[PDB]
Structures are given as C-alpha cells and as structure tokens.
C-alpha cells in the first residue's frame, strides 16, 4: 500500500 | 530538546510565523477558559 522509497534509504 | 523546547519551537512556519490560524486551534484556546 505504501509507495516505494529511494533505495538509498535502506542500503 | 529541553525546557520549553528548543528555541524557535512551537512556532509553525505556515501559521504562527505568518500570523495565520489553522481551523480548529480556536477550539483549544477557547477551552482554556478563552485566550486573549
């Protein structure tokens, strides 16, 4: 349901 | 951060800093046996 967030915030 | 906040805390940019009120804050102040 949430929209993807920029990969640089997971790592 | 600590006592009474941070320094410029509690003053919302789009409201207090522009003297604009959000729709329900009047409700609150009114319940502290009215404010102003």
């Amino acid at each position: 349901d949430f929209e993807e967030i920029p990969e640089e915030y997971l790592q | 951060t600590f006592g009474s906040g941070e320094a410029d805390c509690g003053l919302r940019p789009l409201f207090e800093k522009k003297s604009l009120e959000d729709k329900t804050e009047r409700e609150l102040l009114e319940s502290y046996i009215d404010g102003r």
Binding site: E4 | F2, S4, G5, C9, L11, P13, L14, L28, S31
Partner: protein, 252 residues
Amino acid sequence: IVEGSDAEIGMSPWQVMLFRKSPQELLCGASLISDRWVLTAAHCLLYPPWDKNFTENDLLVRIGKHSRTRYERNIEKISMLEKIYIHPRYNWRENLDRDIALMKLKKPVAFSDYIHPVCLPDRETAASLLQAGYKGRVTGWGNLKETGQPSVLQVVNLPIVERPVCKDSTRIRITDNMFCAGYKPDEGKRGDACEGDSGGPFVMKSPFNNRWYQMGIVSWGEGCDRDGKYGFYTHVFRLKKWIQKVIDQFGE
C-alpha cells in the same frame, strides 16, 4: 484517529512517522523535538508479549509527511537512527507506565515549513494547561475505526478528563505518569486515537506565548472511541528529567 479530520499542510510539522524497512509498513508516530531527536512511545519498539523489539537497523523516520503511503519527493526527509533509548523503568508487564523512548537520528535534519520541532513543556506550562476540560490535539496516520486507513494525517481535539474518571473507566492501574483525554458518552462529541497512532504527540497551544507544547504521547486505550472509555497518554513533563538526562548525556 477516529472522528478526526484531515490535517492542513504544515499543521503538525513535528509529526514523525516511524516506518519499518521490511516489510515497509507504518509502525507508530513520533514527534521531532530538536534536529536530532525523535520522541515516541516505548511500546512501539519493545513489546515482548508480541516479541516486538526493534533495533536501529530496522526503522526509518519519515519527517515532513501529510500523505501516509506516498513518498512525498522533495517534501519529506527520511533519516536513519543512531541510538534508541527506552525509559529504564518502562513497565510492559503491567500498565505501560513510563511509556517513552528517545531516538537519535544518524545526522541532524533541516527544518522547513513541513519540518519544525515542538516544545517540551516546562513545570509552569504543564501546571497551567493540564486541567480537566482543556483540549489537546492528537494526530496520526492510524486507523479510522477500531475495526478504514486514511490517506492524509488526521487531527482530533480532545478534552483532558479528571483522573478519578480516568480510573473508574478501566481495570488497569493508572499511575502519575499517565493522563487520559476524551469526551464523556454524555458530551455527544467523539474522537480518539487508535491503532497506528501510538507514539505520537498530544499537543496544546500556550495561550501565553503562542507556542505548541507536547504534553503527552499516545500510549494506550481499550478500543478506539468506545463510549465510557478514554485514551491514556504518557506524561511527558513528568518524565522530562529523563529526557534531559539522555539528551545532555548523549548529545543534543
């Protein structure tokens, strides 16, 4: 928030969203108090009855939201945590007393018109605004009914209830570090927080210096907007020395 409405853009700049990485889901709300500290409810991180025990590596803090499910590119900031502190006497065995935790961010945040910190109350403000009948506001991307999730941040304004009433509504031991708010079945007005709102701020606007102070944290309740029940919140001022101590002992 049940019987609450959509918020206004920039109405609760200090509202944080605690987001989990895998699965990517909302967990709790939290408030921004300085450019490096977030304040939430300890049971959003540690609740052993459900094997909940999150660590730094498992959460993201999203500051600046309005929308619950959308990455508001160029408006919100997502930080990582450096350290989490739970109150050394949080009681998850009995009544969620001292339900408070502090999270330090990896790097400070930059404030904007969507990100700004809230003030933490001082003995005098605490004394003058925590009276029964005075209204406080709660916000969150929590549920809308007990059993129905909102796209936007909701707001509801609730009255502080008298401790006796708070106590004669439940079978749990209410302590000095809790307070409850809510309308009486009698006051034909509803509203309450609900699942998904835990950890967020309960704030009031000082009529004295026009600032918003965070007086409580969403801690618990039995159901969401039940008649005859109320919501309990951690007593921030009552646990303020703890706050200060970990801040000056570990940073700012």
